[PDB]
């Protein structure tokens, strides 16, 4: 019984519907996510062979162990919906709200956050999972630990090496090859969205808002940003996908060296 294992509390947000909760077994804070079956586009199967939403499949593939990824702790099927029990860090703020309240982040802090997002996306790819909706809204900050957590795999897919022709993520983080041709490859599309994200951290908002800006290939910097960081951003936002860096090249980039540890990040920047 899902209704006997968890004390349900306040709506955290929707747009399915996510409630704050506590596991009765040990007072663990959880988030309880409800998704209507009728509104599910992609379906998959688990080892049991049970037909589940792809989001459930992808969450199980990445939830093994510790990571900068939200952990699926359990799920339930109901007549017209599935219910997901997820980790809930506390205290938490998502990265969109954090940037809204603080403005453009110092490069030292953006370096630490971006690095942690890179490690989490690498973890997804190692587990066979393509997130397809990397953005500040889908990143939680554990304000006490200084750790970032990637959330919302509802638009993701199994990672493959052949072309993708479907996409249901965030258009302003999608690459020009999707805007123009309705096609993209997984890793290079991920790298594009990471360039959008990095710009967003060091400038205080995403660079592009309209299709013509996405395909236009011009990055104007609205804040003071170091030349090394501008170079990395422009490299991630290369118009041709094959011109974009790999994850190894991002993490070897000179702007990325000497990152802060998560605990240092919390103490210097979040406490």
């Amino acid at each position: 019984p899902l209704e006997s294992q968890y004390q349900v509390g306040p709506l955290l947000g929707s747009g399915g519907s996510v409630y704050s909760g506590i596991r009765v077994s040990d007072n663990l804070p959880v988030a309880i996510k409800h998704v209507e079956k009728d509104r599910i586009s992609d379906w998959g199967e688990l080892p049991n062979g049970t037909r589940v939403p792809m989001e459930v499949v992808l969450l199980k593939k990445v939830s093994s162990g510790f990571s900068g990824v939200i952990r699926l702790l359990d799920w339930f099927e109901r007549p017209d919906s599935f219910v997901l029990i997820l980790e809930r860090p506390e205290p938490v703020q998502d990265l969109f709200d954090f940037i809204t309240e603080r403005g453009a982040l110092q490069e030292e802090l953006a370096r630490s956050f971006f690095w942690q997002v890179l490690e989490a996306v690498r973890h997804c790819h190692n587990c066979g999972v393509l997130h397809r909706d990397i953005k500040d809204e889908n990143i939680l900050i554990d304000l006490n630990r200084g750790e970032l957590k990637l959330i919302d795999f509802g638009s993701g897919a199994l990672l493959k090496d052949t072309v993708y022709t479907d996409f249901d993520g965030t258009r302003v983080y999608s690459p020009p090859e999707w805007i123009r041709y309705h096609r993209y490859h997984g890793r290079s599309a991920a790298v594009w969205s990471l360039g959008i994200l990095l710009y967003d951290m060091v400038c205080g908002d995403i660079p592009f808002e309209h299709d013509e800006e996405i395909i236009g290939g011009q990055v104007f910097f609205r804040q003071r940003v170091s030349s090394e960081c501008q170079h990395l951003i422009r490299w991630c936002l290369a118009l041709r996908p094959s011109d974009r860096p790999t994850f190894e090249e991002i993490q070897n980039h000179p702007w990325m060296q000497d990152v802060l540890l998560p605990q240092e990040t919390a103490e210097i920047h979040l406490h």
Partner: peptide
Amino acid sequence: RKRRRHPSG
């Protein structure tokens, strides 16, 4: 200038 969220889809 207006900074806003963007829905997925």
